[PDB]
Structure formats: C-alpha cells, structure tokens
Amino acid sequence: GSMEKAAVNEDGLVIPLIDFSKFLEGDETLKLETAKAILHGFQTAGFIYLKNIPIQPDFREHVFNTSAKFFKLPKEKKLEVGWTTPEANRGYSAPGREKVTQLTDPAEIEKIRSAAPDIKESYEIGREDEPGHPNPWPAEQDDLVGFKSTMNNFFDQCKALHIEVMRAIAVGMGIDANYFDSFVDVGDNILRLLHYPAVKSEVFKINPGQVRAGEHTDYGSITLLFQDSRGGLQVKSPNGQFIDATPIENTVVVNAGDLLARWSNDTIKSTVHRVVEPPKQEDVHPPRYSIAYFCNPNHKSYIEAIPGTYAAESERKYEGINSGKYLVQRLAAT
C-alpha cells in the first residue's frame, strides 16, 4: 500500500498527505490502510492533508470567488449582518482595537495601547434551520446574487465530508464504522469565510507581534481548512516551534479540535496553529483567502471517552460534558 509524501515534515512535525478517495472507493484492504493512516495522523500531528475529496475543485474555486465578492461589499453592508452573540455564532466580524477608558487599570494601559489586532475579517454561516438562530444573509443584489445558494450548498458538502472523515476515524480505530453518525448527523457546524486583506510587510515591523490570526486551538471535532496558495498557516511542532503548513493545490487541511481531543481521551491531538506573514519576501502581501469549516458534535451530544481509547477506567482523564454548552463557553470567554 502506497503512502504519499508527507505534506509537512519538519522539526518532528509530520503531517501526512492522504488520498481520501482510497477510503471512499478502495477495496477493504486499501480502505482500512487509508483509515489507519488518517487516524495515525490525528494521533500524532493532530493535522492531515486530504486530496481527492468529493468536493470538486471548480466548485471550491467558485466558492472562493463568491466569498471574495462578499468581502468586497462596503463596510456598512457587512456590519448590517454583524456577528451578535456566542450563542448564535453567525455573521460578520472584524477585530477592533480595545480602548483605554476610565474603567481601565493603569497596569495594562501600555499593553492596550501597544496591542495589534489580527488583520482579518470573517463571515460565519451556521446550518439554516437551527431553532432560534437564523443566518444573517446579505441582500442578494448585483455580485452577491447566488451567495446564499452557493454557501448553503458548500455547507452541506462539507457536512457530508465531516461525516466521512469521522467514519475513517472509526474504521481506523476498529470500532463500528458508523459510531460517530448519531453524534454528528445534525450538522451543528460553522462555515467561516476568511479574508486577510492585502497588507504592507512593514506593518509587521511597526507592530511587532502582529499576526494575521493569533495562535489557538480549534474547539470542535474537526476543522476542514481550505486555503489559497498565499501561505502563512503555521502548525506547532512536538518541539514547540511553528512550522509552515505549505499550501498544496486541491487539498483540504484537516485538524482535530479540542472536543475530539477530549472525546478521544487525548489519544487524538488538537494542535496549536496560527497565521503569520507568508514565508516569501515582498514589500506588499497580497490578499489571503481561506475557509474554515468548523465541525462539531451535535449540540445535544454528551461527550465522554470513545470505546477503545482507554483500558482501565482510571485512565479516563475527563468528566463527561454536553457538547453545546462546552462550545458556548469557548465562544463567550473573550
């Protein structure tokens, strides 16, 4: 069985490149080999690249084109569909500078004044039919005609992909192939469109510590990350260094989130990542587009150790928790 050359192999960080069609269409031997490679990637790096996924390259290109049209909207039009609450987790956001006020404590005035917010904007789309949380869609006029149908379409295709990656994890684990289905069939996921504007390289010297997206771990089961060719995504190695996650054409970068890490009793890794300047020298960095589809267990799901991830009960690291409650706590914290 032929393994691909690793997508990343640096400083102890080995991110495998895996042909997903071999899980979806292989004979039983190839299917199991591929599933095990998928799992093993999650257990070690917490990240994998997938190629030959069921989402077609020209549709993905159309989705990026559609997202680029949204972000070209005037500022007033984007704020109209602004992010509201952690409970909804839907709409437009652009991080601003914190302000010094009467309430501010003198100890951190220096820090507030010197802080540099992430140079990015985002628009988040949840599933259409979640009770009490409608998506704030922009008006379908001119270039945004077709925006909703395209993004809903993409949402459902990523939703299907999530279900399939979890099946690969289950197969790799040697548990029931369909174990995760009833934990993820609702599709309580979040489609985050990202635009990192063109920025002069010097902004990064004027604001030291300035990034495009701050270091973090994702919250959910897995995240499907579709990046353009610009570069800048970095993943933390076992040795504590950020390593470039080079774009590879027509791949999806897939990482486990904090909930899956906990769910798996820490047999699966949720790995710190960030977006910085592209590794390339240049006076101006062009606009960078990515799309992060955050996958989650159903909000109603109760999360406790998956079978086969511990031997004795004393090996269980975590109390069971409700999935929905956990996520709102992560989203509301800041």
Ligand SMILES: O=C(O)CCC(=O)C(=O)O
């Ligand atoms: O834009 C990227 O490449 C990564 C974004 C990301 O990690 C996130 O939104 O959680």
Ligand SMILES: O=Cc1c[nH]c(=O)[nH]c1=O
């Ligand atoms: O960037 C992290 C995340 C942000 N928003 C979410 O809904 N899930 C995440 O994992």
Ligand code: NI
């Ligand atoms: Ni992330």
